[PDB]
Amino acid sequence: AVVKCKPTSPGRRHVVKVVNPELHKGKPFAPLLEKNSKSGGRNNNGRITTRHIGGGHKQAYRIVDFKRNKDGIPAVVERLEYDPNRSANIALVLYKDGERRYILAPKGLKAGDQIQSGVDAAIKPGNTLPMRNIPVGSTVHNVEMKPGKGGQLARSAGTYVQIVARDGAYVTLRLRSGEMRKVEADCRATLGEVGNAEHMLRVLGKAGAARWRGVRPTVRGTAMNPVDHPHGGGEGRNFGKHPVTPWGVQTKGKKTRSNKRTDKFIVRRRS
């Protein structure tokens, strides 16, 4: 649910929480936990590569099954859980054979609902089938891009893919970016939409709320001194040059895609 707190303190007027009591009020499944050490935006060379990464609350990694390769075995949802490593929630499923796994929680999933992956699976939210068996025009998420590697598209809070066409061994998809991409007709896709759509309405309300997420403050560049950033300085606020990143790139319209390896799966990139 969406909740707007009261202005009992400067730093709480504009806070907007996303509460869901259906989530588990306890510890998660331990066998599916892993250590997740924060990097601070640094690499094997110890140099900052991605700025504004640092701090944040300690997090343990929940092993999620993006493949759903256990076909022909039903599974029922036990409880919904909070996952800090992603924007969406996860679901603790129990297979008939006693195997437990985590999966992304769709829109209208609950506890006790059944799901089945494979080819003969029914067309209901939570089930997973190759897009070869998915009817055209439907909505799916956690889509594979190459058969066998696992879902890579539409994995965020309220994201979904819509199958719009099927030509041959390939199928066309409009992604949440509006891009029209085509992928092979053997990539598993979980039906439905990821359910946390009230996630975009979250308003942090204060600076610390960003530091809990592991986000360090962002310094613009206009006040930076010429040795530091092209925008540099100036007596007052001059900024009389073209917007540019550090290292000298525009950042205000210049397209920087230079892959040329796919060059086939793109149809209606955007615009």
Place this chain on the structure above:
RNA sequence: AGGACCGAACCGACUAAUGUUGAAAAAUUAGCGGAUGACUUGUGGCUGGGGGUGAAAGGCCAAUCAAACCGGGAGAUAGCU
């Protein structure tokens, strides 16, 4: 409940006086600010010089920073003292 209030430890350093061959190569004294938090602290680790880090001051990187320190090129060059 709170980057909430008053307020010690703790962390800070706004004013003033003293001191300025000082007790001290930046402190003392009376007051001041934060004090459950973007807080603070111990231990150990990573990032190495046109590079690092930087809630960005050209700030910090061993009392040294508009390009550290040591050694070397090297008895640099000095139409100037």
Place this chain on the structure above:
RNA sequence: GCUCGCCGGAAGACCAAGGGUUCCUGUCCAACGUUAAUCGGGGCAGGGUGAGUCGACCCCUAAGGCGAGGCCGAAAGGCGUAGUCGAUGGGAAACAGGUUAAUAUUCCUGUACUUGGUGUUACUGCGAAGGGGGGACGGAGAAGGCUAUGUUGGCCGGGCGACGGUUGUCCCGGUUUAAGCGUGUAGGCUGGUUUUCCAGGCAAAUCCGGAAAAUCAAGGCUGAGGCGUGAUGACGAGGCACUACGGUGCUGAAGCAACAAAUGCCCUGCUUCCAGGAAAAGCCUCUAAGCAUCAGGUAACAUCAAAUCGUACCCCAAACCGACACAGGUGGUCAGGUAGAGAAUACCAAGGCGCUUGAGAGAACUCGGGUGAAGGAACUAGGCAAAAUGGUGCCGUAACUUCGGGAGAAGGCACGCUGAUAUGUAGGUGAGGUCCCUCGCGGAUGGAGCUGAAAUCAGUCGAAGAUACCAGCUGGCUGCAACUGUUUAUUAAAAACACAGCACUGUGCAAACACGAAAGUGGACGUAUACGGUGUGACGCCUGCCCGGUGCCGGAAGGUUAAUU
């Protein structure tokens, strides 16, 4: 040695890091000590550090480092797998008392415990570089139940007062005792039990997990403290003999209760919230390969072993970092009494110090302070500085507002002591007795005693009763920035930097982008409600006109146009 004064949430006590003999004793005073010095953290000499239980080493691992082959790279070398290292973390076990000039949970006395090896005996399915469990974990908050500890009383011992009074409702002191073993309570968590079956746990499995039945509700795990034992003991204020008044022998009374009570224990709990909270081993289990009248496992008993290094002393300081015996800096732990909300503050206990030049004088001037006639900011760049305000309760409290605030607005009244109410009340704690009982650390009743506010009425003293230290000046108009925050260590704390929010733009994952000759890593074990960049900077009302120029995104009819030929 008698007094004085100082600290006493330390200027006390025990450690780590660090230092490395500064420790104790004797001796010496040239140099060192900011003076002298018989003294010394000084010179010389000798002596001193005792561990199966503390710590390290050791087993396990985090960040991270190295890294067999290998990938990559002009050489050097870089990244990294298997692995091996790496605490600041996890992992077996000792308490009390006594004792040296200097060491002790290390020696001694007493009483204990843990992990292993060997052997005997008895009962037996043993086995891992594998599987499972467990280890294993956040913040805040609310209590309750306990202890440390303290206070009073009682008990024991001693004392009867340098000056009026003090054989009593008087005074001083003491009133101590461990781990361990045993009981398993307050209270917390969980429903147990038997059998059958199964696409899972890399193969297997009696174990984990899943399903379906049966029979039962009482089963088990965890757990401070208390009680008992430990203890016919040790300790013990004071005595009896030795006593060079430096001390050693024997003896040695009371050794209870009530109240109060922690930030500590139950509590790695409970409740709640979002930012969703290490790993591996030990340990407990499961079988497999394999070995089975073996080997091995299990219980009891016996016996042996538990090595090695560290252990002195300072450690908020004269011994560490600061060139000094330097108003500095340095992490953890123990946390007494009176008043107090309090680890503030004042005064004190234990304990430790008076800060390594003194004496006298009592001028100017300087530093730190105290008081002040009348006036009261006339001072001055400016109320700088200083003065003042200052607590608790009650009453009361404006514009404005994002309806939370503003606000402790402003302002006003009352605060001491004694007595009564009430020989000490409300409340809290709670004995004996009584009743019950699954006869227990039980339950009910019970109210003794202990402790104990606040208020009211009356009376009374003083110039003054929040009398000391401690302890908000207030209000009004206004600029800037929303706010909490961050910043030029060492002249600038700000209107700057961040900020939540808003927008533009890029990025379809081998993502953009960044560090790298490269491999590769970060981004991210993320996937457009995501990530990067840019600018703006809460919220509210709004964000206009202009695409010629620069740039960016698109388009092509034609022209120009490199290498090459």
Place this chain on the structure above:
RNA sequence: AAUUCCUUGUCGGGUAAGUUCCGACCUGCACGAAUGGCGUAAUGAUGGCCAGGCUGUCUCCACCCGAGACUCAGUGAAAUU
């Protein structure tokens, strides 16, 4: 006006008297709408201004308590030349 040269702009308020301050006027030397514009409760060791109270800040200093200064003994510097 954190922007206004002329300029202490003019009028008014406050003051016995106001180059600052507040509020209106527009002739905006040279505001202007995300290098954002106009407002904005709250907050600020923030800048400016007016009051009450308070005072040795001052009219105008006076006395007093301590530490140095001064004398005596011991030890015994420095910049400079």
Place this chain on the structure above:
RNA sequence: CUUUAAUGUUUGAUGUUCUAACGUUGACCCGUAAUCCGGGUUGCGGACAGUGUCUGGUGGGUAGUUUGACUGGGGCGGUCU
């Protein structure tokens, strides 16, 4: 030898298709008790991509440098035969 159509050979451009180079930060197996690496089977891409040499463009992202003299001080102006 002026002339041009079915062939052949010749190479060139474009398009379609294929797989064997190549790629795979897809899957599975072994080395192997190993998310490295390599090999192997297969799938998806596919002569594109990507790399090297050459070459045009862009290129303060990063470097090495320049930016005059006279002058009633210098700069501005003016001047330099």
